[PDB]
Design a protein around this motif. Structure first.
Motif, PDB file in Angstrom:
ATOM      1  N   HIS A 155      43.111  14.007  -7.351  1.00 31.32           N
ATOM      2  CA  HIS A 155      42.321  13.239  -6.386  1.00 31.32           C
ATOM      3  C   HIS A 155      40.915  12.924  -6.988  1.00 31.32           C
ATOM      4  CE1 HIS A 155      39.119  13.147  -3.387  1.00 31.32           C
ATOM      5  NE2 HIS A 155      39.944  12.478  -2.582  1.00 31.32           N
ATOM      6  N   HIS A 156      40.237  13.956  -7.522  1.00 32.93           N
ATOM      7  CA  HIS A 156      38.901  13.852  -8.105  1.00 32.93           C
ATOM      8  C   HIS A 156      38.872  12.884  -9.297  1.00 32.93           C
ATOM      9  CE1 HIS A 156      37.930  16.741  -5.194  1.00 32.93           C
ATOM     10  NE2 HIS A 156      37.304  17.684  -5.898  1.00 32.93           N
ATOM     11  N   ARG A 157      39.890  12.929 -10.186  1.00 35.44           N
ATOM     12  CA  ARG A 157      39.968  12.030 -11.343  1.00 35.44           C
ATOM     13  C   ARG A 157      40.139  10.556 -10.924  1.00 35.44           C
ATOM     14  NH1 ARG A 157      43.035  16.491 -13.665  1.00 35.44           N
ATOM     15  NH2 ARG A 157      44.993  15.420 -13.169  1.00 35.44           N
ATOM     16  N   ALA A 158      40.874  10.320  -9.828  1.00 36.45           N
ATOM     17  CA  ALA A 158      41.146   8.980  -9.309  1.00 36.45           C
ATOM     18  C   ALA A 158      39.884   8.283  -8.759  1.00 36.45           C
ATOM     19  CB  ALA A 158      42.215   9.053  -8.227  1.00 36.45           C
ATOM     20  N   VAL A 159      38.899   9.060  -8.236  1.00 39.91           N
ATOM     21  CA  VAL A 159      37.708   8.471  -7.596  1.00 39.91           C
ATOM     22  C   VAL A 159      36.372   8.765  -8.267  1.00 39.91           C
ATOM     23  CG1 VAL A 159      38.825   8.349  -5.290  1.00 39.91           C
ATOM     24  CG2 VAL A 159      37.380  10.351  -5.887  1.00 39.91           C
ATOM     25  N   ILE A 160      36.291   9.759  -9.169  1.00 39.71           N
ATOM     26  CA  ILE A 160      35.029  10.169  -9.769  1.00 39.71           C
ATOM     27  C   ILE A 160      34.201   8.998 -10.365  1.00 39.71           C
ATOM     28  CG2 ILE A 160      36.059  10.959 -11.977  1.00 39.71           C
ATOM     29  CD1 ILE A 160      33.763  13.267 -11.965  1.00 39.71           C
ATOM     30  N   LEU A 161      34.822   8.101 -11.155  1.00 34.37           N
ATOM     31  CA  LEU A 161      34.082   6.993 -11.782  1.00 34.37           C
ATOM     32  C   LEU A 161      33.631   5.952 -10.750  1.00 34.37           C
ATOM     33  CD1 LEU A 161      35.862   6.478 -15.232  1.00 34.37           C
ATOM     34  CD2 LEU A 161      34.060   8.126 -14.619  1.00 34.37           C
ATOM     35  N   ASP A 162      34.372   5.817  -9.637  1.00 31.24           N
ATOM     36  CA  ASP A 162      33.963   4.905  -8.556  1.00 31.24           C
ATOM     37  C   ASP A 162      32.694   5.478  -7.882  1.00 31.24           C
ATOM     38  OD1 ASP A 162      36.336   3.486  -9.189  1.00 31.24           O
ATOM     39  OD2 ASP A 162      37.419   4.344  -7.482  1.00 31.24           O
TER      40      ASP A 162
ATOM     41  N   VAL B  85      33.666  14.408 -17.404  1.00 33.78           N
ATOM     42  CA  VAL B  85      32.918  13.188 -17.083  1.00 33.78           C
ATOM     43  C   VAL B  85      31.419  13.378 -17.362  1.00 33.78           C
ATOM     44  CG1 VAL B  85      32.266  11.492 -15.293  1.00 33.78           C
ATOM     45  CG2 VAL B  85      34.649  12.242 -15.500  1.00 33.78           C
ATOM     46  N   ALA B  86      30.800  14.467 -16.806  1.00 33.12           N
ATOM     47  CA  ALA B  86      29.376  14.780 -16.989  1.00 33.12           C
ATOM     48  C   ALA B  86      29.048  14.860 -18.475  1.00 33.12           C
ATOM     49  CB  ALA B  86      29.000  16.085 -16.291  1.00 33.12           C
ATOM     50  N   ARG B  87      29.868  15.597 -19.245  1.00 30.72           N
ATOM     51  CA  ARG B  87      29.675  15.705 -20.696  1.00 30.72           C
ATOM     52  C   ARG B  87      29.781  14.349 -21.375  1.00 30.72           C
ATOM     53  NH1 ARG B  87      34.081  19.964 -20.361  1.00 30.72           N
ATOM     54  NH2 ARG B  87      32.994  21.871 -19.717  1.00 30.72           N
ATOM     55  N   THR B  88      30.719  13.453 -20.922  1.00 29.55           N
ATOM     56  CA  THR B  88      30.924  12.133 -21.550  1.00 29.55           C
ATOM     57  C   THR B  88      29.722  11.218 -21.309  1.00 29.55           C
ATOM     58  OG1 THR B  88      33.354  12.385 -21.427  1.00 29.55           O
ATOM     59  CG2 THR B  88      32.512  10.173 -21.927  1.00 29.55           C
ATOM     60  N   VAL B  89      29.236  11.130 -20.063  1.00 32.61           N
ATOM     61  CA  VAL B  89      28.094  10.269 -19.777  1.00 32.61           C
ATOM     62  C   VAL B  89      26.834  10.817 -20.459  1.00 32.61           C
ATOM     63  CG1 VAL B  89      29.106   9.183 -17.714  1.00 32.61           C
ATOM     64  CG2 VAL B  89      27.508  11.103 -17.440  1.00 32.61           C
ATOM     65  N   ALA B  90      26.683  12.154 -20.560  1.00 29.44           N
ATOM     66  CA  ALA B  90      25.526  12.736 -21.253  1.00 29.44           C
ATOM     67  C   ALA B  90      25.505  12.264 -22.715  1.00 29.44           C
ATOM     68  CB  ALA B  90      25.553  14.262 -21.181  1.00 29.44           C
ATOM     69  N   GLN B  91      26.676  12.259 -23.380  1.00 31.91           N
ATOM     70  CA  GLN B  91      26.799  11.863 -24.786  1.00 31.91           C
ATOM     71  C   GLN B  91      26.626  10.351 -24.981  1.00 31.91           C
ATOM     72  OE1 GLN B  91      29.801  14.457 -27.198  1.00 31.91           O
ATOM     73  NE2 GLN B  91      30.458  14.517 -25.073  1.00 31.91           N
ATOM     74  N   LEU B  92      27.247   9.549 -24.097  1.00 29.74           N
ATOM     75  CA  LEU B  92      27.171   8.080 -24.117  1.00 29.74           C
ATOM     76  C   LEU B  92      25.733   7.570 -23.988  1.00 29.74           C
ATOM     77  CD1 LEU B  92      30.227   7.032 -21.816  1.00 29.74           C
ATOM     78  CD2 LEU B  92      30.031   6.642 -24.350  1.00 29.74           C
ATOM     79  N   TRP B  93      24.979   8.170 -23.066  1.00 36.34           N
ATOM     80  CA  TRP B  93      23.621   7.771 -22.759  1.00 36.34           C
ATOM     81  C   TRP B  93      22.605   8.558 -23.584  1.00 36.34           C
ATOM     82  CZ3 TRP B  93      24.216   8.224 -16.680  1.00 36.34           C
ATOM     83  CH2 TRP B  93      25.223   7.345 -16.251  1.00 36.34           C
ATOM     84  N   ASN B  94      23.085   9.559 -24.337  1.00 39.09           N
ATOM     85  CA  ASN B  94      22.283  10.459 -25.171  1.00 39.09           C
ATOM     86  C   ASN B  94      21.190  11.149 -24.326  1.00 39.09           C
ATOM     87  OD1 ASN B  94      21.543  11.866 -27.538  1.00 39.09           O
ATOM     88  ND2 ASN B  94      20.049  10.286 -28.060  1.00 39.09           N
ATOM     89  N   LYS B  95      21.640  11.821 -23.269  1.00 39.49           N
ATOM     90  CA  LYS B  95      20.801  12.533 -22.316  1.00 39.49           C
ATOM     91  C   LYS B  95      21.131  14.032 -22.356  1.00 39.49           C
ATOM     92  CE  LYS B  95      19.097   8.660 -20.764  1.00 39.49           C
ATOM     93  NZ  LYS B  95      17.653   8.359 -20.715  1.00 39.49           N
TER      94      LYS B  95
END
Ligand SMILES: [Mg+2]
Lengths: 84, 334, 48
Positions: free
Chosen positions: B47-54, B91-101
């Protein structure tokens, strides 16, 4: 022991590194039964599983592929990676 | 600074944006299962994987902030369900790396406490943390949120949720809320075990007792499902009030703060506020937007942590199903 | 390029799984398709 090795290609070495950085930190839920190791060389993410049980090995590989799919969707939707 | 917070430790998934004490966005979704059933880790993570990015894009758009306006990524390190915690962290780890935060792994209870402190403005309260996953009496002292009392078995919210399943009460919006609405119509007080253990509590015995009383009703009909909801609440909430009072008395606390999903219950709030009134103390309680698990609580505790110098390197970002409240060094307080 | 899985049981018999272009299409869309196909092959390999 039961062994499973998965090799995943990414568009760039930086995207393979990011996927490794995101997927590698978590311990397997049943460590004594199923264990895994993640490495990255160039654009290739390598996942190596070692298991005592066949059913729990399938579950671990399927669970991983679902997490990998989510990471891929994150990189697609919120990427490209900013220059660093 | 502006912090982007991710939460999905139980059946709620949320993304929050917090900037210098202001909640800029807090979208959330709840995984609701059919009556009589409980959410399982596997289906909850799906359920969480289906909506997290939205939810993530909803939070960005509502806040008015873009990727590079965010100073830190916060996520729940634990405690909670394994599969859902991993899905949120990846997800949190991916956006942190993508945005370099930078990244900050937050303890779920500290998220509730820090959001509780931000919204209500509590100075030095005795904290009662009650949900489906936790039941603790906490008091801040010397850079630790110290556990003075706790459940020795199941959380009070788990006792309430499982009782809703036996009576096949709806899980929409929550089994707890529906137990609460049914309890208001209750007229007969059914006696139940009262199991306080000094500063600690037990709920396994009460749940097994009321399960038997419920099966006795479906067969004989001495009382109504509304009477049992009323009775269960009167017992479990009186017990929570007693252990909170015992902690308040031992520390000289003039304030009480209730955090977690069960903190939404207006009857528990009424019972605690009454105990506080007789003691000459104040009762602090958050509203429906923040009592339930949400991303903004993670962004708030993350904000406090980031500023004080807490950082979670990726190699040390692994989630933990067991993460105790007193394991975090509270360096953002004196 | 290619997503591949290699199963080696306690007996020592190795079983290989593989998913098949870097053209005009979206690279991540292609990768997502491969992962979904790999889930099917892993299910099929371990079920019997
Ligand atoms: Mg909670």
């Amino acid at each position: 022991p039961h062994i499973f090795t998965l090799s995943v290609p990414f568009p760039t070495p930086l995207e393979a590194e990011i996927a490794h950085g995101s997927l590698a930190p978590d311990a397997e839920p049943h460590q004594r039964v199923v264990g895994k190791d993640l490495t990255v060389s160039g654009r290739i993410l390598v996942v190596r599983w070692k298991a005592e049980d066949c059913r729990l090995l399938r579950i671990s590989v399927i669970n991983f592929l679902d997490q990998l799919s989510l990471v891929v969707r994150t990189m697609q939707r919120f990427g490209p990676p900013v220059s660093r | 600074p502006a912090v982007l917070g991710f939460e999905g430790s139980a059946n709620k998934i949320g993304v929050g944006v917090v900037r210098d004490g202001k909640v800029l966005a807090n979208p959330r979704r709840t995984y609701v299962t059919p009556p009589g059933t409980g959410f399982l880790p596997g289906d909850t993570a799906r359920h969480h994987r289906a909506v997290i990015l939205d939810l993530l894009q909803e939070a960005l758009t509502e806040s008015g902030l873009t990727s590079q306006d965010i100073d830190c990524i916060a996520y729940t390190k634990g405690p909670g369900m394994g599969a859902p915690l991993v899905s949120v962290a990846v997800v949190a780890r991916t956006v942190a790396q993508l945005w370099n935060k930078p990244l900050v792994g937050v303890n779920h209870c500290i998220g509730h406490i820090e959001m509780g402190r931000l919204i209500t403005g509590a100075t030095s309260p005795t904290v009662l943390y009650v949900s489906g996953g936790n039941t603790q009496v906490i008091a801040y002292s010397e850079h630790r949120y110290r556990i003075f009392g706790e459940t020795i078995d199941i959380a009070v919210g788990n006792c309430l949720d499982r009782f809703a399943r036996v009576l096949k009460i709806s899980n929409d919006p929550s089994p707890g809320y529906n137990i609460e609405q049914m309890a208001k119509r209750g007229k007969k007080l059914v006696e139940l075990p009262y199991t306080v253990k000094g500063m600690d509590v037990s709920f396994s015995g009460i749940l097994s007792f009321i399960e038997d009383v419920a099966h006795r009703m479906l067969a004989t009909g001495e009382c109504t499902p509304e009477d049992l909801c009323f009775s269960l609440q009167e017992t479990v909430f009186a017990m929570l009030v007693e252990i909170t009072e015992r902690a308040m008395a031992h520390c000289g606390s003039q304030e009480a703060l209730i955090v977690g999903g069960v903190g939404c219950n207006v009857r528990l709030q009424e019972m605690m506020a009454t105990m506080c009134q007789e003691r000459g103390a104040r009762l602090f309680a958050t509203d429906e937007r923040f009592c339930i698990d949400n991303g903004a609580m993670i962004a708030q505790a993350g904000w406090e942590m980031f500023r004080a110098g807490h950082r979670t390197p990726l190699s040390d970002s692994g989630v933990t199903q067991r993460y105790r409240t007193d394991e975090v060094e509270v360096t953002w307080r004196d | 390029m290619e997503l591949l899985g290699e199963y080696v049981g306690q007996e020592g018999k190795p079983q290989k799984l593989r998913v098949s272009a870097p053209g005009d299409g979206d690279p991540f869309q292609g990768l997502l398709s491969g992962v979904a196909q790999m889930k099917d092959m892993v299910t099929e390999l371990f079920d019997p």
